[PDB]
């Protein structure tokens, strides 16, 4: 037998609370989509040897380590995982957390265990700052996690904390039946030390900017999703993309390759709103005229301003498993 | 037969978005408690004449009008409602909405109808600004509604809007198993035109203040509730009570009678946090030392600084109905 697992990608709108005086830090607004997706089959390894196929080396080593640990934890068989459809690594799709939880849950099912995904996340050391991928793995839809309570020492040295349980979702909603335009831009994958050094230049952000981001997320995005108000939703997405303090810093860190696409989407009458997922290269867009947006993205792809584009829709469930032979 | 309905009071922490440039207006953070409570019995009026007992005149006239309308709407019998336990009127307990929805739903049950409470609210003209009482009637617990999308004209004349469907809850959580100390202060019930004139002096509030209130609510109160973090919860409640721009204006409008109690609660080591519900007179407090807080409130009541006090707990369900004879 095999356990077949499917999971959605995570698209992130913004991180919220990154100032040096707030009661809490982090917080992520995010949604789940069908494409790109993860599709993987977990079965007993014939030779009793853990085996991983169909991912980049970093994720494959990490899946092997996860399977060797869960094998010891649940006293299960050595597993092979064949990843038939991989989430693109370090592209703004939340691939590591989404894949570790999907495969872990699947191996869990193979072991006759039904794991808590927040616990599995903890066990595999995921969602230290973000609860987005962890929550969407469980629920799908649109979600905002409440990040982490800040300690009394926080105001003194905000840089030590900002950088064991993943934040639970303070908002979880079904995403309306609106199509999502995914835009794969030209974008570098960021340099670990270049990134840490970049983050320590931008953060802590002004307190007022944390507050405005909470306001745009909780009193902009989230009610628009809940009330299925397309115009309200797009107004909030654009306010985040084009005015969000931390988002602006992410766009500038990625540079012209992403900025040119966001400005093109804003300019285009076929694109009602557009966003950068994390630091990309994945951007995502909303349109009440997808026929027009298709034609717009096809020309950007021809010109070589983007590498690729596709329409997808929200996943309002999270991961799914089937037994197959 | 009779339908016996019980419903919790609504305690309000703060209104959120009351500036002249925000994507949305209003928004309420609130919770449901057992005491004060509503307890009412709805039966067929023997003489075929609508009858209301056990409330103040304003609410009684309004319940009669509601029963005469729902009678016509659902083609039901003339009802009598005996309100055995009334929510105190205009005291910060959300009595009108809570009572209209409880009695309407009960009469509904008498008519063999199961009404949508948001629709019933609309029908009876409730939750024009607040969704707090409407949502807590349905769910109980702790909730934050997302208020109302602001029109394009809003930025021009914010005063026209600020002042048909009630806002749905963007956050709904179970309240943890913490006791709530209710403090009934000396407080005037506000003058309709004194209030409208007061509101037009304070609102619109600065944009930065709207943003900080969203931040304290969504990235303060709500995650603390979700994670059952008492110290985090109290830190957020106090930040709202003592620094909330709009809350400060409500305290100053009510004056010394409420301000003296809030300052006493803040000063008291037995009171970890305290809040004013709307403009009161009801305040409410949290304590990890309720034995000490009991002794503190007993002395304030003896001295005559408060009229009354009681402990209660959260109601995590909303209204409940039973059939009785
Ligand atoms: N910069 C991040 C992250 C980081 O990605 C990593 C994976 O996250 P998940 O896939 O577990 O959700 C985390 O380390 C988080 O810091 N998330 N959202 C953002 C954002 O800017 O919106
Ligand atoms: N100033 C209000 C109101 C008003 O009370 C009335 C009843 O509300 P519900 O009982 O339907 O929730 C509404 O008209 C609202 O404007 N609510 N919360 C507040 C607050 O300051 O927190
Ligand atoms: Na556009
Ligand atoms: Na105190």
From TrEMBL, chains A, B:
<dbReference type="InterPro" id="IPR036554">
    <property type="entry name" value="GHMP_kinase_C_sf"/>
</dbReference>
<keyword id="KW-0418">Kinase</keyword>
<keyword id="KW-0547">Nucleotide-binding</keyword>
<protein>
    <submittedName>
        <fullName>Beta-ribofuranosylaminobenzene 5'-phosphate synthase</fullName>
    </submittedName>
</protein>
<dbReference type="InterPro" id="IPR020568">
    <property type="entry name" value="Ribosomal_Su5_D2-typ_SF"/>
</dbReference>
<keyword id="KW-0067">ATP-binding</keyword>
<dbReference type="InterPro" id="IPR014721">
    <property type="entry name" value="Ribsml_uS5_D2-typ_fold_subgr"/>
</dbReference>
<dbReference type="Pfam" id="PF08544">
    <property type="entry name" value="GHMP_kinases_C"/>
</dbReference>
<feature type="domain" description="GHMP kinase C-terminal">
    <location>
        <begin position="222"/>
        <end position="295"/>
    </location>
</feature>
<dbReference type="GO" id="GO:0005524">
    <property type="term" value="F:ATP binding"/>
</dbReference>
<dbReference type="InterPro" id="IPR013750">
    <property type="entry name" value="GHMP_kinase_C_dom"/>
</dbReference>
<dbReference type="InterPro" id="IPR004422">
    <property type="entry name" value="RFAP_synthase"/>
</dbReference>
<feature type="domain" description="GHMP kinase N-terminal">
    <location>
        <begin position="65"/>
        <end position="132"/>
    </location>
</feature>
<dbReference type="Pfam" id="PF00288">
    <property type="entry name" value="GHMP_kinases_N"/>
</dbReference>
<dbReference type="InterPro" id="IPR006204">
    <property type="entry name" value="GHMP_kinase_N_dom"/>
</dbReference>
<dbReference type="GO" id="GO:0016301">
    <property type="term" value="F:kinase activity"/>
</dbReference>
<keyword id="KW-0808">Transferase</keyword>
